[PDB]
Design a protein around this ligand. Structure first.
Ligand SMILES: Nc1ncnc2c1ncn2[C@@H]1O[C@H](CSCC[C@H](N)C(=O)O)[C@@H](O)[C@H]1O
Length: 310
């Protein structure tokens, strides 16, 4: 069930892109275009998610002048590496982690499609990519098959791909931590904090899950054999912040997605709202109030990391 979320996320993102929510010429190479009608509330939610996460990544890249690493944990078919390259934003090295099966799928897409492999090769120090098995390693981009609940495997394979614990490092978990136990996600967060002197962590996932709407969401996901093993932490923005502060992080900010959406520039909101008609604002408000964007920093005072916002 948990691996299946990668496909769902990719399917939803490509669909939103096809309607014009944001620009992504790469996602087509990793997933088919869904053909059925969706709630516009869902597309707006995906846009807010992607925008918020992107804003935070770009703020980190500005503060570090791109002299840094990005590690995307549970990255699925994310295209952020290619989209950043196009914007002339390239970290020193960009790392992705997912289950071996998911990584195999992603490497197959890259190997089959020159629009994906070429940009990687352009920046590499060799005239070829070694992509056998569950690892792609290159100068500026690595994709690693590892179970995030096995921290020894995670660290070993990241270090095999020359992850440098001395660079300011941004770690991202976009709709990932909720699938592991509270102990497993806490251990991951603590591992990250212990590993890096100067760091930032972005967590996007559910929030306010104790109410009826949240209980219904949980059961709809348990109905598809996909348990929200970490949903306890999604009680509130407070429980989200506490998990960060109690596992080695120095700062913790969190916002629900409705507030984020309400704080978007007027131009972005007008553009977004132009794409599809939405009849009842309350379904939207409800959905947006049950997701959150959280970020934590440590050792960032010289870089001004605690000043980063969405
Ligand atoms: N224990 C674990 N180890 C490695 N990957 C995991 C994991 N638990 C969940 N994942 C991955 O987390 C992803 C959740 S779907 C979200 C994908 C991507 N971050 C996006 O936002 O578009 C899936 O690809 C799933 O395989």
């Amino acid at each position: 069930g948990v691996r299946g979320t990668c496909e769902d996320a990719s399917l939803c993102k490509r669909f939103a892109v096809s309607i014009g929510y944001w620009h992504d010429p790469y996602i087509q190479h990793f997933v088919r275009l869904s053909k059925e009608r969706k709630a516009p509330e869902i597309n707006r939610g995906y846009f807010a998610r992607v925008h918020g996460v992107s804003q935070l990544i770009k703020a980190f890249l500005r503060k570090t002048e791109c002299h840094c690493q990005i590690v995307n944990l549970g990255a699925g078919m994310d295209t952020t590496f290619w989209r950043l390259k196009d914007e002339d934003l390239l970290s020193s090295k960009y790392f992705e982690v997912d289950f071996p099966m998911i990584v195999t799928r992603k490497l197959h897409s890259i190997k089959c499609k020159p629009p994906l492999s070429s940009p990687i090769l352009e920046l590499h120090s060799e005239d070829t990519l070694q992509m056998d098995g569950h690892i792609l390693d290159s100068k500026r981009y690595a994709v690693i098959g590892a179970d995030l609940r096995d921290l020894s495997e995670l660290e070993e394979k990241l270090k095999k791909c020359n992850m440098n614990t001395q660079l300011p490092t941004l770690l991202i978990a976009e709709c990932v931590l909720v699938y592991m136990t509270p102990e497993q996600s806490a251990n991951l967060l603590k591992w990250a904090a212990n590993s890096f002197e100067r760091a930032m962590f972005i967590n996007y996932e559910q929030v306010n899950m104790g109410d009826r709407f949240g209980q219904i969401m949980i059961e709809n996901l348990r109905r598809r054999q996909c348990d929200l093993a970490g949903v306890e932490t999604c009680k509130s923005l407070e429980s989200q912040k506490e998990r960060l502060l109690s596992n080695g992080w120095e700062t913790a900010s969190a916002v629900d997605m409705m507030e984020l959406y309400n704080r978007l520039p007027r131009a972005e909101v007008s553009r977004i709202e132009s794409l599809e008609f939405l009849d009842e604002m309350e379904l939207l408000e409800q959905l947006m109030r049950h997701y959150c964007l959280c970020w934590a920093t440590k050792g960032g005072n010289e870089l001004g990391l605690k000043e980063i916002t969405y």
